[PDB]
Amino acid sequence: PECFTANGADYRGTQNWTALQGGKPCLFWNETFQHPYNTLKYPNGEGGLGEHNYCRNPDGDVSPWCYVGVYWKYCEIPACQMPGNLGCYKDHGNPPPLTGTSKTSNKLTIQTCISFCRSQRFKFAGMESGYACFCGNNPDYWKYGEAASTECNSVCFGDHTQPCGGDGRIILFDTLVGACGGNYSAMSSVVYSPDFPDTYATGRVCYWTIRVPGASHIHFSFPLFDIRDSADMVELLDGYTHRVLARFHGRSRPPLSFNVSLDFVILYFFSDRINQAQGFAVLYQAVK
Amino acid sequence: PECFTANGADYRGTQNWTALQGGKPCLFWNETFQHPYNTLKYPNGEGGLGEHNYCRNPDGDVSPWCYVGVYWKYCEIPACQMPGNLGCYKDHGNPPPLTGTSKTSNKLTIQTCISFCRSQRFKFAGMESGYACFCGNNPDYWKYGEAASTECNSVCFGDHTQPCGGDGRIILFDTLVGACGGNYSAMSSVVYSPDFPDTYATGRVCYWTIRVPGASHIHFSFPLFDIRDSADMVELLDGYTHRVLARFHGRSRPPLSFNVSLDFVILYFFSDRINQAQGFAVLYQAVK
Ligand SMILES: *[C@@H]1O[C@H](CO)[C@@H](O)[C@H](O)[C@H]1NC(C)=O
Ligand SMILES: *[C@@H]1O[C@H](CO)[C@@H](O)[C@H](O)[C@H]1NC(C)=O
Ligand SMILES: *[C@@H]1O[C@H](CO)[C@@H](O)[C@H](O)[C@H]1NC(C)=O
Ligand SMILES: *[C@@H]1O[C@H](CO)[C@@H](O)[C@H](O)[C@H]1NC(C)=O
Ligand SMILES: *[C@@H]1O[C@H](CO)[C@@H](O)[C@H](O)[C@H]1NC(C)=O
Ligand SMILES: *[C@@H]1O[C@H](CO)[C@@H](O)[C@H](O)[C@H]1NC(C)=O
Ligand SMILES: [Ca+2]
Ligand SMILES: [Ca+2]
């Protein structure tokens, strides 16, 4: 996976066509001087612009894009799909792709939808048309077929940096995403900060247990780590002893990655009441 | 103040009469071998027993006591009254000492009463008879007079380690006690962990601001510090910069005391979801 955000703001791969099939080539960011976004407005490489023509998302749009009057287009990047975004699917009406429950909200975000469905004990949450939230446990949310991820790019009504599906198009998420806690026993998975992909709420204490029977060690990486405060903190505890193995906060970041020689770890997050930020994504991989 | 707990479990002063006036002298704990409590059952000085006859509370009774068939008695120790316990007062009925609101609860504790009143925006909370909670903003809760603190020693129905008043006797607390947050501007005050004097709840994030216009420094001491986990933590932040000045947790305790050369500090507490403990009491004293 090359993206651990919902809008691929963290994408830093080398796709430079709007689509791998039938796409247009991207312009170079160090020559797009007519346009708002180019390397001269953003020295220091902010949002990943540089001396290339690779798809990027520097302005908080819903997906990566590039300059190509249609002077820019979204890129359809298959590897850029955060873990837990299960895809964009067609919704032909009756029955719907998820059959559990639904609501509409003028402030819908991915997480407010996810959160609504999770509450009600549903496995899957789907957003359509920017404002409609569908929940379900149905395994066959793909019933009407997959759609290009670009057909799910309506802005969420509550957050314009986030995609919320489309007309007859539903963007699907596992409701574990951004839960405040959870048990993980898979060989490898990703854990997101609470409320992800919204910024994390103030005053959260959340922990997740990672227990992989038979592991000799577990490898941790933090492909996303955007925690604001010395007071916000992410901690890994030894599961058996509760000893704090590592403490990360806004002023002491994680190495690319590191290994813990345990089969049982507890990841804790504490959020203060000062400033919120995008949060984190931790990828763990157990090794036998 | 010689006690920062509600039952004086932390009292370590030298009173060895049950009362300073008309009292009986206490027996020595290193010769009370008939009794459950003595220095041979508790080597390592637990609950402050040693080679003395000083009032102590090693068994989680509601107040300090000593051996003197009435073979033991509570001690009436004027200095042992935690900051925010405003005293024990007479209640002669109509009108009551606090006139705001009331409830009864089979699980009453000091904090559940305090919490109920605070919620409703009352300054004062009072417990009577072990089970009755009274709230009020009335300044004259002392209207019927003070009583010996020993007349307020009914066990709280929800916590037998805590006093909850008596028949016609009300024990009074400032509702700031154990609040999850607050602003302090006094020259000196005490801040307690959340839910104090109950053990702190799991999953709390609380902060209190101490801002004393014109202070050159603020002196902090921790006369009580009973935090269980490496994962629970108390932190002091610079108010202007939010820099974490000191981090204390279950495995790294505070010095007797220390000074911060600021007029503006934020005290933060984070409580994990593993084990709770009695909590803390921080005494600050600003200096000009
Ligand atoms: C895409 O970028 C690569 C550099 O990674 C470059 O070799 C190639 O010229 C690019 N293709 C197009 C059409 O820009
Ligand atoms: C921008 O950078 C590319 C890749 O190095 C370079 O080939 C190109 O000529 C540059 N264009 C300008 C206007 O700097
Ligand atoms: C972590 O785990 C693997 C063994 O599975 C090891 O080969 C690799 O070098 C380790 N990485 C670090 C940073 O220790
Ligand atoms: C009280 O204890 C003090 C020691 O601090 C001792 O001098 C004195 O003998 C005691 N008085 C009584 C009656 O025990
Ligand atoms: C206990 O300690 C006191 C104070 O030191 C001492 O005077 C007394 O004789 C001791 N009694 C016994 C039985 O050890
Ligand atoms: C703290 O403050 C006072 C000045 O008000 C100073 O005299 C005292 O020595 C200080 N204590 C510590 C531990 O610095
Ligand atoms: Ca924060
Ligand atoms: Ca704890």
Residue numbers in the entry:
A (entry chain A), B (entry chain A): 30 to 97, 103 to 322
What text appears in the publication on this structure?
Kremen 1 and 2 have been identified as co-receptors for Dickkopf (Dkk) proteins, hallmark secreted antagonists of canonical Wnt signaling. Mechanistically it is thought that, in the presence of Dkk, Krm forms a ternary complex with Lrp6, which is then rapidly endocytosed. Structurally, Krm1 and 2 are type I transmembrane proteins with a 40 kDa ectodomain and a flexible cytoplasmic tail consisting of 60–75 residues. KRM1ECD emerges as a rigid molecule with tight interactions stabilizing a triangular arrangement of its Kringle, WSC, and CUB structural domains.
We solved the structure of KRM1ECD in three crystal forms at 1.9, 2.8, and 3.2 Å resolution. The high-resolution structure is a near full-length model. The KR, WSC, and CUB are arranged in a roughly triangular fashion with tight interactions between all three domains. The KRM1 structure reveals the fold of the WSC domain for the first time. The structure is best described as a sandwich of a β1-β5-β3-β4-β2 antiparallel β sheet and a single α helix. The structure is also rich in loops and is stabilized by four disulfide bridges (C122-C186, C147-C167, C151-C169, C190-C198). In crystal form I, a calcium ion is present at the canonical position (Gaboriaud et al., 2011) coordinated by the carboxylates of D263, D266 (bidentate), and D306, as well as the carbonyl of N309 and a water molecule. The coordination sphere deviates significantly from perfectly octahedral (not shown). The F207S mutation recently found to cause ectodermal dysplasia in Palestinian families (Issa et al., 2016) maps to the hydrophobic core of the protein at the interface of the three subdomains.
